[PDB]
Write an enzyme that holds these catalytic residues in place. Structure first.
Site, PDB file in Angstrom:
ATOM      1  N   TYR A 194       0.844  -1.197   0.000  1.00 25.20           N
ATOM      2  CA  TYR A 194       0.000   0.000   0.000  1.00 25.20           C
ATOM      3  C   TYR A 194       0.881   1.250   0.000  1.00 25.20           C
ATOM      4  CZ  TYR A 194      -5.076  -0.499   0.032  1.00 25.20           C
ATOM      5  OH  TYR A 194      -6.390  -0.565  -0.404  1.00 25.20           O
ATOM      6  N   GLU A 203      -0.282   4.662  -0.839  1.00 24.69           N
ATOM      7  CA  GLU A 203      -1.024   5.909  -0.994  1.00 24.69           C
ATOM      8  C   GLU A 203      -0.135   7.116  -0.723  1.00 24.69           C
ATOM      9  OE1 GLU A 203      -5.696   4.610  -0.109  1.00 24.69           O
ATOM     10  OE2 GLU A 203      -4.668   6.023   1.249  1.00 24.69           O
ATOM     11  N   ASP A 252      -4.311  14.430 -25.606  1.00 29.02           N
ATOM     12  CA  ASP A 252      -4.302  13.020 -25.238  1.00 29.02           C
ATOM     13  C   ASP A 252      -3.499  12.292 -26.312  1.00 29.02           C
ATOM     14  OD1 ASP A 252      -4.734  10.335 -24.657  1.00 29.02           O
ATOM     15  OD2 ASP A 252      -6.921  10.557 -24.432  1.00 29.02           O
ATOM     16  N   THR A 274      -1.763   6.819 -22.410  1.00 27.33           N
ATOM     17  CA  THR A 274      -1.655   5.475 -21.866  1.00 27.33           C
ATOM     18  C   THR A 274      -0.211   4.998 -22.009  1.00 27.33           C
ATOM     19  OG1 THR A 274      -2.328   4.438 -23.971  1.00 27.33           O
ATOM     20  CG2 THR A 274      -4.060   4.863 -22.342  1.00 27.33           C
ATOM     21  N   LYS A 325       0.169   1.473 -25.574  1.00 33.54           N
ATOM     22  CA  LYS A 325      -0.075   1.374 -27.008  1.00 33.54           C
ATOM     23  C   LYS A 325       1.252   1.365 -27.775  1.00 33.54           C
ATOM     24  CE  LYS A 325      -4.813   3.161 -26.756  1.00 33.54           C
ATOM     25  NZ  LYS A 325      -5.018   3.574 -25.367  1.00 33.54           N
ATOM     26  N   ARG A 374      -0.410  -1.908 -19.002  1.00 33.53           N
ATOM     27  CA  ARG A 374      -1.687  -1.213 -19.127  1.00 33.53           C
ATOM     28  C   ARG A 374      -1.794  -0.168 -18.015  1.00 33.53           C
ATOM     29  NH1 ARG A 374      -5.850  -2.310 -22.622  1.00 33.53           N
ATOM     30  NH2 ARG A 374      -4.475  -3.947 -23.466  1.00 33.53           N
TER      31      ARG A 374
HETATM   32  O1  LIG Z   1      -7.822  13.068   4.968  1.00 25.66           O
HETATM   33  C1  LIG Z   1      -7.017  12.756   4.111  1.00 25.66           C
HETATM   34  C2  LIG Z   1      -6.428  13.777   3.207  1.00 25.66           C
HETATM   35  C3  LIG Z   1      -6.764  15.144   3.301  1.00 25.66           C
HETATM   36  C4  LIG Z   1      -6.178  16.065   2.417  1.00 25.66           C
HETATM   37  O2  LIG Z   1      -6.501  17.358   2.505  1.00 25.66           O
HETATM   38  C5  LIG Z   1      -5.242  15.616   1.431  1.00 25.66           C
HETATM   39  O3  LIG Z   1      -4.658  16.535   0.549  1.00 25.66           O
HETATM   40  C6  LIG Z   1      -4.906  14.273   1.340  1.00 25.66           C
HETATM   41  C7  LIG Z   1      -5.508  13.332   2.238  1.00 25.66           C
HETATM   42  O4  LIG Z   1      -5.143  12.027   2.118  1.00 25.66           O
HETATM   43  C8  LIG Z   1      -5.666  11.038   2.939  1.00 25.66           C
HETATM   44  C9  LIG Z   1      -5.242   9.646   2.754  1.00 25.66           C
HETATM   45  C10 LIG Z   1      -5.776   8.596   3.594  1.00 25.66           C
HETATM   46  O5  LIG Z   1      -5.379   7.254   3.434  1.00 25.66           O
HETATM   47  C11 LIG Z   1      -6.723   8.927   4.598  1.00 25.66           C
HETATM   48  C12 LIG Z   1      -7.286   7.850   5.531  1.00 25.66           C
HETATM   49  O6  LIG Z   1      -6.108   7.091   6.121  1.00 25.66           O
HETATM   50  C13 LIG Z   1      -6.466   5.917   6.967  1.00 25.66           C
HETATM   51  C14 LIG Z   1      -5.327   4.951   6.929  1.00 25.66           C
HETATM   52  O7  LIG Z   1      -5.714   3.831   7.724  1.00 25.66           O
HETATM   53  C15 LIG Z   1      -7.737   5.164   6.552  1.00 25.66           C
HETATM   54  O8  LIG Z   1      -8.280   4.505   7.703  1.00 25.66           O
HETATM   55  C16 LIG Z   1      -8.791   6.048   5.934  1.00 25.66           C
HETATM   56  O9  LIG Z   1      -9.819   5.231   5.366  1.00 25.66           O
HETATM   57  C17 LIG Z   1      -8.209   6.879   4.849  1.00 25.66           C
HETATM   58  O10 LIG Z   1      -9.259   7.555   4.122  1.00 25.66           O
HETATM   59  C18 LIG Z   1      -7.128  10.290   4.780  1.00 25.66           C
HETATM   60  O11 LIG Z   1      -8.073  10.613   5.805  1.00 25.66           O
HETATM   61  C19 LIG Z   1      -6.592  11.348   3.931  1.00 25.66           C
HETATM   62  C1  LIG Z   2      -6.536   8.280 -27.195  1.00 30.56           C
HETATM   63  C2  LIG Z   2      -7.041   7.446 -26.004  1.00 30.56           C
HETATM   64  N1  LIG Z   2      -7.123   7.998 -24.753  1.00 30.56           N
HETATM   65  C3  LIG Z   2      -7.580   7.267 -23.688  1.00 30.56           C
HETATM   66  C4  LIG Z   2      -7.971   5.956 -23.862  1.00 30.56           C
HETATM   67  C5  LIG Z   2      -8.502   5.147 -22.609  1.00 30.56           C
HETATM   68  O1  LIG Z   2      -7.511   4.252 -22.200  1.00 30.56           O
HETATM   69  P1  LIG Z   2      -7.880   3.087 -21.119  1.00 30.56           P
HETATM   70  O2  LIG Z   2      -8.625   2.027 -21.847  1.00 30.56           O
HETATM   71  O3  LIG Z   2      -6.614   2.575 -20.532  1.00 30.56           O
HETATM   72  O4  LIG Z   2      -8.736   3.683 -20.020  1.00 30.56           O
HETATM   73  C6  LIG Z   2      -7.891   5.371 -25.128  1.00 30.56           C
HETATM   74  C7  LIG Z   2      -8.341   3.900 -25.311  1.00 30.56           C
HETATM   75  N2  LIG Z   2      -8.288   3.564 -26.753  1.00 30.56           N
HETATM   76  C8  LIG Z   2      -9.260   2.542 -27.189  1.00 30.56           C
HETATM   77  C9  LIG Z   2     -10.605   3.128 -27.579  1.00 30.56           C
HETATM   78  O5  LIG Z   2     -11.604   2.839 -26.611  1.00 30.56           O
HETATM   79  C10 LIG Z   2      -8.632   1.894 -28.411  1.00 30.56           C
HETATM   80  O6  LIG Z   2      -8.712   0.668 -28.661  1.00 30.56           O
HETATM   81  O7  LIG Z   2      -8.035   2.685 -29.195  1.00 30.56           O
HETATM   82  C11 LIG Z   2      -7.427   6.122 -26.186  1.00 30.56           C
HETATM   83  O8  LIG Z   2      -7.315   5.587 -27.528  1.00 30.56           O
HETATM   84  C1  LIG Z   3     -13.497   0.500   2.779  1.00 34.14           C
HETATM   85  C2  LIG Z   3     -12.572   0.940   1.630  1.00 34.14           C
HETATM   86  N1  LIG Z   3     -13.072   1.308   0.404  1.00 34.14           N
HETATM   87  C3  LIG Z   3     -12.228   1.695  -0.607  1.00 34.14           C
HETATM   88  C4  LIG Z   3     -10.860   1.706  -0.412  1.00 34.14           C
HETATM   89  C5  LIG Z   3      -9.925   2.188  -1.606  1.00 34.14           C
HETATM   90  O1  LIG Z   3      -9.464   1.133  -2.400  1.00 34.14           O
HETATM   91  P1  LIG Z   3      -8.219   1.452  -3.426  1.00 34.14           P
HETATM   92  O2  LIG Z   3      -7.032   1.951  -2.671  1.00 34.14           O
HETATM   93  O3  LIG Z   3      -7.940   0.169  -4.118  1.00 34.14           O
HETATM   94  O4  LIG Z   3      -8.674   2.556  -4.379  1.00 34.14           O
HETATM   95  C6  LIG Z   3     -10.336   1.339   0.839  1.00 34.14           C
HETATM   96  C7  LIG Z   3      -8.810   1.367   1.120  1.00 34.14           C
HETATM   97  N2  LIG Z   3      -8.600   1.893   2.513  1.00 34.14           N
HETATM   98  C8  LIG Z   3      -7.217   2.335   2.839  1.00 34.14           C
HETATM   99  C9  LIG Z   3      -7.186   3.761   3.365  1.00 34.14           C
HETATM  100  O5  LIG Z   3      -7.193   4.775   2.357  1.00 34.14           O
HETATM  101  C10 LIG Z   3      -6.642   1.407   3.907  1.00 34.14           C
HETATM  102  O6  LIG Z   3      -5.423   1.188   4.026  1.00 34.14           O
HETATM  103  O7  LIG Z   3      -7.422   0.850   4.711  1.00 34.14           O
HETATM  104  C11 LIG Z   3     -11.197   0.959   1.836  1.00 34.14           C
HETATM  105  O8  LIG Z   3     -10.717   0.559   3.144  1.00 34.14           O
END
Ligand SMILES: O=c1c2cc(O)c(O)cc2oc2cc(O)c([C@@H]3O[C@H](CO)[C@@H](O)[C@H](O)[C@H]3O)c(O)c12
Ligand SMILES: Cc1ncc(COP(=O)(O)O)c(CN[C@@H](CO)C(=O)O)c1O
Ligand SMILES: Cc1ncc(COP(=O)(O)O)c(CN[C@@H](CO)C(=O)O)c1O
Ligand SMILES: O=c1c2cc(O)c(O)cc2oc2cc(O)c([C@@H]3O[C@H](CO)[C@@H](O)[C@H](O)[C@H]3O)c(O)c12
Lengths: 410, 411
Positions: free
Chosen positions: B50, B52, B196, B222, B225, B231
């Site tokens: 992780y 973030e 793009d 992307t 390509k 990807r």
């Molecule tokens: O609040 C912010 C935040 C506010 C800002 O202004 C900014 O620029 C960036 C920010 O990044 C964040 C990133 C985070 O992971 C979290 C929280 O960390 C915990 C880690 O266990 C989780 O339990 C929460 O689920 C998760 O959401 C945050 O709360 C924040």
């Molecule tokens: C210029 C451009 N910008 C963004 C994207 C989106 O990329 P993604 O599929 O990774 O989200 C594509 C996807 N390109 C796909 C069309 O859906 C393709 O087969 O060409 C793209 O061609």
């Molecule tokens: C309930 C829930 N829904 C969504 C997400 C986001 O998933 P992603 O990081 O794959 O986008 C999290 C991740 N949660 C992170 C904190 O940002 C963690 O370490 O716990 C989550 O706990």
């Protein structure tokens, strides 16, 4: 050999493999996926464009990629009892973005769990799409029990008249009563969305109440207690929401799916269908309760709510004269990885916080039993109690090395 | 191995898909074949971390080494395209564009973008996409008789509609895009410029297409390509104030944790693109595409949109053979040639049929095809579409495909 041509990159990866071997990973949302999951993610499936859904793609050549995606879809329905599953979300955040698009309109009022009380960023934060696009109101935990007060959730629902109630958490260690959220949602005519990302593996193992029958839409990640690759997933029992979900994912907010990651999802889902996965999940919770017992009996480490029902715990560390970033930095110096975390009714800034968060899924995967989890909690206490005593801290590092050598990861 | 015996359902499907990539001509313009180094990065233990936040400013402990990997990707991207700022965390081209819009405009703002049936992407304003739903898109297309962008029409539309943002870039346009003219038109109207460059990024990196990074306020791409990476997406800028808005929009704006194993693969692929050998590969892409256009121009029934190509791809109107785009896609797939159906400018048929197919050369070029092999591919495509389902001719196409794929194996 390809690693010869990019030594800077491959050295950094080797060092990260050693860091995972030599550290105790206690971040509650992390795990160690199997070699099969990593091989799926490292396969030639990354080469296939596959916009659309199995049997209705926008490219030629998808006949075998459709098997892979069908296995992920169908195993998710088997694991969770959902009638419909979408396995294309690139992440939990994307899953939640798509789920909202299928349930509410921009500007609608949504009632979600407060960030400092365990809610996730995508449950209403003002710097997130969720907080920018919708009008979020928070519910928290009772100040004295530090568990959800459902009567106050009912009060907030009645006053605010939300279109949607979100349940599910990032830092909540107790059982969530989905039936109560559903009854509250019904009372005010709101829909119910559950984000089970953290507890999905416990839900599949039957060790946490299943939200799928209660929620209009259930979202999850595939990489926490489910022990899969990083990615998202959306479940529902209502065909009309399924159609909206599928359109919101693609062409709504995503393009091509990551089919090598989806193969990894399919791999992890069948691992979760094996009976050994229930034993794994039982051990996760047993280990977590054992650590909570140690911290409860320790001087200076207060367990938020005083118990755990799942994989995680929040420790208030203020009585040891440190804040969360300090305790995390201390533990980092002895090869113990946690993260700082706010506590209910947090008084410090998010950059310091009063607590740490610990969870056992990763160390349980390495093979840690209850006795070993007890040792981990004891080493965490001693490292924090050791105010600046490099003598004590070096003993901790030795205790860490004993645990990591006893349970090789590789 | 043993884990394949645990899950034959899954591992047999992956093996079949390996065999299909080996045995087919992959002519989908947006696909490629990544190196074993890229795949090994994506199958690495980095999936467990992780991370973030951004390097040196993470929300979790333990990110010392993922910071090296992500910083390698960031710095190699900056070196590749000459940008002062680079964000390598977007999960996809779609998320990259989502975050770029968030840094440039507000909901409801007017945006001018390339029309989808003229070659613009879903995220360039389609009303079933977040882009068309969230902003007010106005489209520019191509001239009906030349089928290239008419920059006066773009200027006219810019002036009539006063866009806050002009978007250039395409997914189904085979001609050089004049980013300088787009910058002129943007300035005259006071709009910003987003490019793009997903499809042509590899050609840009190799100096075979004008570079938009010095002209666009934000460039998105992307990585999978013509760049031949994993990807994923990426966002480039030279303005520091936009770089901070971009970084905030990616995280915590629309994403959570980055995919650091994928970011590893981006770092691998960017290094492969800095190699001088990548410029030789990119030139062979264009030479192969032009050799194919020459064949299609000469054949009866396969009309190349605009009559030429400047890059990796080409659009072929198939209507004069009495088929639509989906029928052509199915015929070709039945003889182990993989394309996608695709709208042509001024598309008269349903989006589920379309009037044409799209063909690009990056993947067969990665297999080592040369211009004479590209010529053979195009002749095979013509033969297959002209065979009114005559099995004798279709099987000769299958034999021709087998010859080329055995001549250039994928391993
Ligand atoms: O609040 C912010 C935040 C506010 C800002 O202004 C900014 O620029 C960036 C920010 O990044 C964040 C990133 C985070 O992971 C979290 C929280 O960390 C915990 C880690 O266990 C989780 O339990 C929460 O689920 C998760 O959401 C945050 O709360 C924040
Ligand atoms: C210029 C451009 N910008 C963004 C994207 C989106 O990329 P993604 O599929 O990774 O989200 C594509 C996807 N390109 C796909 C069309 O859906 C393709 O087969 O060409 C793209 O061609
Ligand atoms: C309930 C829930 N829904 C969504 C997400 C986001 O998933 P992603 O990081 O794959 O986008 C999290 C991740 N949660 C992170 C904190 O940002 C963690 O370490 O716990 C989550 O706990
Ligand atoms: O319009 C739709 C669409 C509408 C719906 O209602 C729906 O459910 C699904 C849809 O999927 C689509 C998938 C696509 O690849 C495209 C377009 O194909 C070409 C390349 O392949 C390019 O010219 C565009 O860059 C590309 O974006 C589409 O236009 C659409």
């Amino acid at each position: 050999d390809y690693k010869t041509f990019d030594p800077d990159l491959w050295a950094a990866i080797a060092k990260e493999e050693e860091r995972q071997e030599h550290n105790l990973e206690l971040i509650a949302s992390e795990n160690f996926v199997s070699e099969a999951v990593m091989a799926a993610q490292g396969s030639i499936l990354t080469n296939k464009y596959a916009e659309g859904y199995p049997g209705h793609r926008y490219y030629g050549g998808c006949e075998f990629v459709d098997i892979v995606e069908n296995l992920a879809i169908d195993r998710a329905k088997e694991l969770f009892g959902a009638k419909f599953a979408n396995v294309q979300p690139h992440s939990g955040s994307q899953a939640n973005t798509a789920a909202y698009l299928a349930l509410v309109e921009p500007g609608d009022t949504i009632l979600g769990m407060d960030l400092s009380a365990g809610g996730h960023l995508t449950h209403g934060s003002p710097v997130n799409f969720s907080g920018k696009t919708y009008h979020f109101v928070a519910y928290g935990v009772d100040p004295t029990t530090e568990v959800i007060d459902y009567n106050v959730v009912r009060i907030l629902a009645r006053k605010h008249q939300p279109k949607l109630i979100v349940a599910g958490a990032s830092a909540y260690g107790r059982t969530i009563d989905f039936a109560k959220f559903r009854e509250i949602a019904d009372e005010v005519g709101a829909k119910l969305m559950v984000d089970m990302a953290h507890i999905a593996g416990l839900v599949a193992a039957g060790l946490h109440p299943n939200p799928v029958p209660y929620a209009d839409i259930t979202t999850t990640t595939t990489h926490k207690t489910l022990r899969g690759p990083r990615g998202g997933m959306i479940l529902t029992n209502d065909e009309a929401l399924a159609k909206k979900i599928n359109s919101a994912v693609f062409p709504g907010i995503q393009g091509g799916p990551l089919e090598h990651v989806i193969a990894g999802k399919a791999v992890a889902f069948k691992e979760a269908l094996d009976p050994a996965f229930k034993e794994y999940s039982e051990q996760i919770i047993a280990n977590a309760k054992a650590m909570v017992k140690v911290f409860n009996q320790a001087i200076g480490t207060r367990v938020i709510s005083g118990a755990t029902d799942n994989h995680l715990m929040l420790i208030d560390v203020r009585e040891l004269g440190i804040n969360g970033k300090e305790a995390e930095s201390i533990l980092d110096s002895v090869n113990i990885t946690v993260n700082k975390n706010s506590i209910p009714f947090e008084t410090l800034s998010p950059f310091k916080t009063s607590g740490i968060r610990i969870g056992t899924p990763a160390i349980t995967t390495r093979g840690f039993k209850e006795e070993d989890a007890v040792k981990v909690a004891e080493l965490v206490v001693k490292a924090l109690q050791a105010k600046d005593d490099n003598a004590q801290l070096d003993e901790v590092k030795t205790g860490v090395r004993e645990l990591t050598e006893k349970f090789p990861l590789h």
